[PDB]
Nucleic acid binder design. Structure first.
Length: 118
DNA sequence: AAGATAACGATATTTA
DNA sequence: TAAATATCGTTATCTT
């Protein structure tokens, strides 16, 4: 199977983990025979886990992601370790869709992040 | 549509 | 070295 997960699916995962843990991902074929370990792991870490955060993007967060992108590259795994609860893919999305297109000039000539308007 | 967010596919990095 | 998992660009899928 491919494409977005069903709440039924999300349940098999939560079971597996609760049961075995979030690691021996290949043998999670024992459940959801139609979904790669690869894709299940991903669903957990990025979308199911207790730690994933759900509130909108605080401009604080935006600042952080920005400030490091300037110094570091697109080293998201690293940045996702600096913003508690936000995964690495989440950040990757924040920058490409929002933060990327609101960078700007300053008058001591150093880029500054505009505040979004959505 | 434009504005986000979720998942794919290829590849690199960690681990036992 | 190999099998397991972690990372990242691109893309498929919402959401507004």
């Amino acid at each position: 199977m491919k494409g977005p997960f069903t709440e039924a699916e999300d349940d098999l995962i939560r079971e597996y983990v609760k049961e075995n843990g979030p690691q021996n991902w290949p043998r999670i074929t024992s459940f959801l025979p139609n979904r790669s370990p690869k894709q299940c792991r991903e669903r957990w870490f990025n979308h199911l886990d207790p730690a994933v955060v759900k509130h909108a993007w605080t401009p604080e967060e935006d600042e952080t992601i920005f400030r490091n992108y300037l110094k570091l590259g697109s080293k998201w795994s690293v940045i996702a370790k600096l913003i508690p609860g936000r995964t690495d893919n989440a950040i990757k999305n924040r920058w490409n869709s929002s933060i990327s297109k609101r960078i700007s000039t300053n008058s001591n000539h150093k880029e500054i992040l505009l505040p979004d308007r959505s």
